[PDB]
TrEMBL record, chain A:
Included range, full protein: 554 to 704 of 904
Domain of life: Viruses
Native species: Pectobacterium phage PhiM1
Protein name: Internal virion protein B
TrEMBL record, chain D:
Species for this entry: Pectobacterium phage PhiM1
Top-level taxon: Viruses
Protein name, as recorded: Putative internal core protein
Length: 151, 1103, 74, 74, 73
């Protein structure tokens, strides 16, 4: 699910990417748990059952963009009312191919960025990309793309 | 038996609403969108939900229990679901939910599903995350983000490039196919070239968007580098050591410190690379001030009794004490660094209780502080103690603001300039005080909103009183709407606009007549009986239960406002007035009746009324003639105070005798044999008779509580104050205009009601450190964006050229400004046209209503919004007619030969020219020619509405140069509307806040551009944007959003309730508390920004 | 004093069947509970109050002097 | 007569800090513990100023968003 | 009567206002009021609704003893 290729002989570069992606998944799970708790909709589970519930919730929204470098890139799509209005399709295999140009351009503009985060702004019908740092802190790089051309 | 004693001695359980405070809690602001749904007999929202009540969060139930019929419940259950879906997406990031409290229009104005719950959750989240280092900074930053994302614009594309890009998809996305059908053994190239069906569109980053960032370091100690990027001290230090191979082996000291604020550089890994070796050592030398963070913790009970540090602080304080007798901690510690000979002073002394110089042992403890490792690195700091652009800065009073017009050198000027851009009243209070001293004392009693004393101005009390009335006017308004909900579905209203208006006039007459009987019967101890029309009973019942009739009579008697005890009370009370409109309209159709008959008519009544006082016949005729002269003035809106000081302003006989009982059924006979009676000229409508009474009585009650229960001394106190300034004429005029506005009279200008804006004055210092200035600065930059886009849009279209150009010409700009501002139409000669158009046509007459009824959601948000456009367009049409009539009278032949198309002739024109020359003032036309030119204009007004529907220029109007700018206007606006609905397609609140601005913004731009040119200065986009602020400050822009959301009586509740929620928070802030709740409540003007983004960016998209 | 109040607590509904083992003044002292912990502590104190006076009941006169010498009572 | 009603407000102040400050914590950080009372006193004093001036002018009262202040005022 | 918000400016440029010196605690403000009002109410019911004659009745009583200074004290 992390999208790493080498499975027999691995260099330190793969180790760094795995380490970053584990923290990314942890941050996503923390945000999901906080959002669920605030609405008062958490299930009656504890420990491993809750961990599995959260992991299953997060697992459905993961997409492994392909191009840009080796190991590609990893993104977690935001939650939307209905996918057919924003993304234009309910299948992830098409969005994965469609996001390639935007991801490649974003990485070309900001080489120093290691990870990418995606968010949706309903008020102006806009998709936003931003670089992220460890400890759930955010960077200064940002980009904007309308939904119409993506569809 | 025994269990009876236990419960007999317990205390009663608390109510089930005493708990849940700050979550449940004003229904009018929550049922606007469902107003016109008829009530269902015997419906009960609890009995209809049944088992389903177990799937809601204790506030959704609160919002659902208001249903009065099944359809209303069905619609509420639908809205509650969209409210969940919207907030699910925003939950992906915790910070964004904090900014949702200030940027969701539905939540800050009204209509949303719960407002208190969201705010009380945002405050808790902001407090939690801080455990951007204090709760205020979390609130401040949450909005800095979520608004800095540069938007993308559409652009035309070449078809070939897009198809090439799309083809590289599918490929690179079909390599994951299994290919078990048509294997590679059975593949062949097709004999024709395919091509996909993509559209030719690009996206391009915008260029004019500002780079918005929020300053959150001014009120804290911080380090400046090279006086941008913002980081922390414990982050910067590590980077220095890593990329510090050119440093003396100091590097170990840096490593030790790195394992032990805010920093700003004017890419981090390269900033430190562009620094010399010397500077980056001073960077560590100043970072050695880490003691301050630790001195504070040992003064506060944070480091309770932890050894090492607790002892080091004590034995530094002891040395601090010693130096005084023999030769706060922060200044001593700072002096240890920022000086040379101070260190030399301590070398010449040894300690009284241990070996070593006094200086030596002082350093021993600093290392324990900024390292924390108990008691060898003294050599490093000793050698680091031996000009660069790195400094340690103490907190400063004036934040850094990016906008041009807000920068000031000290704190008083900055505060004065900030409040000016938010509220209209401030610049008025400021201008009143320049008239000497007597004015200053009187200003505080009229317009100010004091924050630190009980004695408060008259406007404040009037505002407070005017909310009570509207809470009960609304309940009757919603009954009128429901009476016609049937028999007139939305589709029918759009076809028969003219006839639809009479369905209201009939009910108004019926109800008004019914309320006359029940009053006179109640006053004489008889019995009331119902009517046989089912609508009238419901309308009357909604009126008695509304209960405003007794409330007003009770309130007006409070403070004993002049001769108010003479009135009589009953639940069915309703005032009485004559109407100047019904008189003119009746005298127009019939021309056998002349002024000679109305005066004789009133003479008969007056002669009989005062018989017992020996009224001589001459006075009878004088009074009869002065009941007609001051009745025409009522229709033209030229009245004002100083003519109703004897008593109250609602008696038709007092207002006639003061200027130096009627049968209402006695029949008079005219010259031609037609019979006439005074009953035909009485006012009939209800709502237009309730609002007028309430507005003026609120103004009188507010003025009394300030210290003027009677206006007779109020006039004198003004006449005396004006005779102190160097120019008494201006001061008297200003005070008269202010008093007319307070009492609710037509001043002739187009401005919002005075009660809608506040004049907060108080503590400057406390406000500055709250952080409001940073949030006010941000909302003020986005104006540049919208106005720049509007100017570019005018520059692009062909119609925009010559329209932005007539506004510069001195030959025509002045007249266009007057046409936009409606200065010739609101009062005076020509108001007949506006009255005829205003209340004799419906939204169906716009034409644009038909063209969009199905894209826009066909609901209330459509009809509620279209009234705003009606009332916008009527003024423009009337102003155009008024301009083109005066132009004709001036002498322009081309206009005269177009005027005559509707009935002019030499006889009328000669008399008009003669009359205008004798007196150019002409507050009204003479009685000799009134009824002809009045009819000529009305014929014109109708024709333009029919030909102009499409947004076209009629053939006979080609002569008018200014008309070329007004008539085609509505086609220009329709272009912007199409592009927005091609982007959202919903028409929710955020879309309404964009459409309203799309319609209303350009007019302000043209008016401001015209205003700048005549003053002989260049017209640049920044200049236009700055001049627009002195016409419509930020808090008045939000007025338009409220105007497009609600109509009529429901508008006042929302518009007023925002201002008091601002005053009540700034008052608490000025006192000394800065709870983040206060900061959230204190900036209601910040809601329109996301709506501004949609309109501003949408004007750059290609078609 | 310093025990937080419990929302919707009712001392009569929490005792249930147990109300049949008290002397009509112990019930008076027990009906003041505002939360479960307070009731649990009151039920504990009522027991020490019985144990103390059991010993003093061995001699009738000593119970007469108990009215003037028990600090908690005076 | 006065003290019969001063006490009911005293017991509310104690209960507002019963949580967030168990007896063991009070014994470690004596100096800082004093500010937790000064903060609530300021908040409540400020809140009671608004509701008085609004009551005297015939307006309406509204609650606050901090759960302790509502209980203290009640 | 005091504005309580109007801002004054000192010699050094620091701004100052009278709001900073108001009392804030509640309990220490309730007990002080109650204790003195109880004392005034009790004194009124004894026959001295106003202290002006209460002072006089003491000044007159002291001038009878052999040592007026001690009695007044």
């Amino acid at each position: 699910m992390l999208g790493i290729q080498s499975w027999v002989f691995t260099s330190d570069a793969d180790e760094k990417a795995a380490q970053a992606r584990v923290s990314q998944v942890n941050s996503a799970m923390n945000n999901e748990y906080v959002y669920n708790q605030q609405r008062g909709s958490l299930p009656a589970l504890v420990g491993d059952d809750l961990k599995s519930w959260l992991m299953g919730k997060v697992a459905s929204r993961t997409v492994r963009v392909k191009d840009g470098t080796d190991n590609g890139a990893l993104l977690v799509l935001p939650e939307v009312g209905d996918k057919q209005k924003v993304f234009g399709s309910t299948d992830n295999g098409i969005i994965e191919s469609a996001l390639t140009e935007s991801v490649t351009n974003f990485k070309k503009q900001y080489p120093q960025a290691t990870t990418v985060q995606m968010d949706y702004d309903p008020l102006t019908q806009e998709l936003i990309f931003q670089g992220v740092n460890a400890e759930n802190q955010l960077g200064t790089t940002r980009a904007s793309i309308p939904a119409a051309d993506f569809r | 038996n025994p269990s009876a004693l236990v419960q007999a001695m317990q205390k009663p359980v608390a109510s089930v609403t005493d708990s849940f405070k700050a979550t449940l809690s004003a229904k009018a602001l929550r049922g606007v969108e469902y107003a016109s749904i008829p009530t269902e007999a015997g419906f009960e929202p609890s009995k209809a939900l049944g088992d389903s009540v177990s799937q809601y969060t204790a506030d959704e139930l609160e919002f659902l229990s208001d249903a009065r019929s099944s359809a209303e419940l069905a619609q509420r259950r639908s809205q509650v679901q969209d409210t969940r879906n919207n907030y699910d997406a925003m939950g992906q990031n915790m910070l964004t939910t904090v900014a949702a409290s200030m940027l969701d229009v539905d939540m800050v104005i009204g209509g949303g599903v719960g407002a208190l719950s969201k705010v009380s959750r945002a405050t808790r989240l902001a407090v939690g995350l801080s455990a951007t280092i204090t709760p205020l900074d979390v609130v401040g930053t949450s909005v800095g983000i979520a608004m800095s994302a540069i938007p993308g614009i559409r652009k035309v594309a070449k078809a070939e490039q897009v198809q090439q890009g799309a083809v590289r998809g599918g490929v690179n996305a079909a390599e994951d196919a299994a290919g078990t059908v048509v294997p590679p053994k059975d593949v062949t190239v097709p004999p024709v070239r395919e091509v996909p069906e993509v559209q030719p569109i690009k996206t391009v980053a915008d260029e004019d968007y500002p780079k918005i960032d929020i300053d959150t370091y001014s009120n804290k100690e911080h380090i400046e580098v090279g006086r941008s990027l913002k980081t922390t001290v414990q982050n910067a230090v590590l980077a220095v050591t890593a990329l510090g191979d050119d440093l003396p082996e100091v590097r170990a000291l840096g490593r030790a410190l790195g394992a032990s604020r805010a920093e700003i550089f004017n890419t981090l890994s390269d900033h430190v690379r562009g620094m010399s070796t010397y500077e980056k050592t001073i960077l560590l030398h100043e970072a050695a001030h880490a003691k301050t963070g630790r001195s504070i913790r040992a003064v506060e009970s944070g480091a309770v009794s932890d050894g090492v540090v607790y002892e080091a602080v004590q034995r530094i304080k002891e040395i601090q004490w010693y130096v005084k007798a023999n030769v706060d901690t922060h200044e001593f510690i700072s002096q240890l660094f920022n000086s040379e000979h101070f260190r030399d002073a301590l070398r010449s002394v040894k300690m009284p209780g241990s070996d070593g110089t006094l200086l030596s042992n002082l350093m021993k403890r600093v290392v324990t502080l900024f390292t924390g490792k108990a008691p060898n690195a003294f050599d490093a700091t000793l050698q680091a103690f031996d000009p660069a652009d790195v400094f340690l800065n103490a907190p400063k009073a004036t934040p850094d603001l990016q906008s041009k017009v807000l920068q000031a050198p000290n704190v008083i000027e900055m505060n004065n300039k900030v409040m000016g851009a938010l509220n209209r009243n401030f610049s008025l209070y400021e201008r009143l005080k320049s008239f000497g001293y007597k004015a200053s004392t009187l200003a505080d009693q009229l317009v100010v909103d004091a924050t630190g004393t009980e004695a408060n101005s008259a406007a404040h009390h009037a505002r407070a009183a005017h909310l009570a009335s509207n809470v009960s006017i609304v309940q009757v308004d919603d009954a009128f709407r429901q009476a016609l909900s049937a028999d007139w579905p939305l589709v029918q209203r759009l076809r028969h606009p003219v006839l639809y208006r009479e369905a209201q006039r009939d009910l108004s007459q019926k109800v008004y007549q019914q309320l006359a009987e029940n009053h006179d019967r109640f006053l004489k101890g008889q019995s009331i009986q119902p009517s046989n029309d089912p609508r009238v009973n419901s309308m009357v019942d909604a009126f008695v239960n509304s209960n405003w009739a007794k409330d007003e009579l009770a309130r007006v008697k409070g403070a004993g406002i002049n001769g108010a005890d003479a009135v009589r009370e009953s639940p069915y009370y309703l005032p009485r007035q004559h109407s100047g409109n019904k008189l003119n309209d009746f005298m127009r159709n019939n021309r056998q009746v002349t002024k000679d008959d109305i005066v004789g008519m009133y003479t008969e009544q007056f002669s009989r009324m005062f018989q017992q006082n020996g009224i001589t016949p001459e006075t009878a005729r004088k009074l009869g003639a002065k009941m007609f002269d001051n009745m025409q003035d009522q229709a033209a809106h030229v009245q004002g105070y100083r003519q109703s000081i004897a008593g109250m302003s609602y008696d038709d006989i007092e207002n006639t005798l003061e200027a130096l009982e009627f049968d209402m059924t006695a029949q008079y006979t005219t010259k031609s044999g037609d019979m006439i009676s005074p009953s035909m000229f009485v006012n009939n409508d209800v709502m237009g008779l309730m609002e007028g009474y309430s507005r003026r009585m609120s103004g009188r009650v507010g003025l009394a509580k300030a210290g003027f229960p009677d206006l007779r001394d109020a006039v004198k106190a003004i006449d005396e104050a004006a005779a102190e300034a160097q120019d008494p004429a201006a001061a008297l005029h200003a005070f008269d205009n202010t008093m007319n506005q307070i009492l609710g009279y037509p001043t002739g200008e187009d401005v919002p009601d005075i009660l809608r804006s506040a004049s907060i004055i108080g503590g400057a210092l406390n406000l500055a450190n709250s952080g409001i200035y940073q949030l006010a600065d941000m909302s003020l930059m986005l104006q540049q964006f919208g106005i720049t886009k509007t100017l570019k849009a005018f520059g692009s279209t062909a119609f925009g050229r010559n329209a932005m150009d007539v506004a510069k010409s001195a030959e025509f700009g002045s007249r266009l400004q007057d046409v936009i501002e409606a200065r010739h139409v609101l009062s005076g000669k020509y108001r007949s046209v506006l009255t005829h158009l205003e209340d004799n046509r419906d939204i169906g007459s716009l034409g644009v209503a038909h063209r969009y009824v199905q894209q826009m959601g066909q609901g209330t948000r459509f009809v509620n919004g279209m009234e705003f456009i009606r009332r916008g367009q009527a003024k423009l049409v009337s102003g155009l007619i008024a301009d083109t009539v005066d132009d004709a009278i001036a002498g322009n032949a081309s206009a005269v030969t177009a005027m005559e198309r509707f009935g002019l002739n030499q006889q009328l024109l000669d008399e008009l020219r003669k009359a205008t020359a004798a007196n150019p003032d002409m507050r009204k036309w003479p009685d000799s020619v009134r009824m002809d030119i009045e009819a000529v204009t009305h014929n014109m007004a109708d024709s333009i509405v029919l030909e102009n529907r499409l947004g076209e220029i009629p053939a006979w109007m080609q002569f008018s140069s200014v008309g070329k700018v007004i008539l085609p206007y509505m086609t220009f606006v329709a272009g912007a509307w199409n592009k927005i609905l091609r982007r959202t397609a919903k028409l929710d609140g955020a879309t309404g806040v964009a459409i309203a601005l799309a319609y209303q913004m350009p007019l302000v731009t043209l008016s401001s551009a015209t205003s700048i040119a005549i003053s002989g200065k260049p017209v640049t986009p920044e200049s236009v944007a700055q001049r627009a602020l002195v016409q419509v400050p930020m808090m008045s822009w939000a007025g338009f959003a409220v105007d497009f959301w609600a109509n009529g009586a429901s508008n006042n509740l929302a518009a007023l309730a925002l201002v008091d929620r601002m005053h009540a928070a700034m008052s608490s802030i000025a006192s000394g508390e800065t709870n983040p709740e206060s900061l959230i409540k204190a900036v209601p003007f910040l809601s329109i920004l996301p709506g501004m983004r949609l309109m501003g960016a949408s004007l750059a998209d290609d078609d």
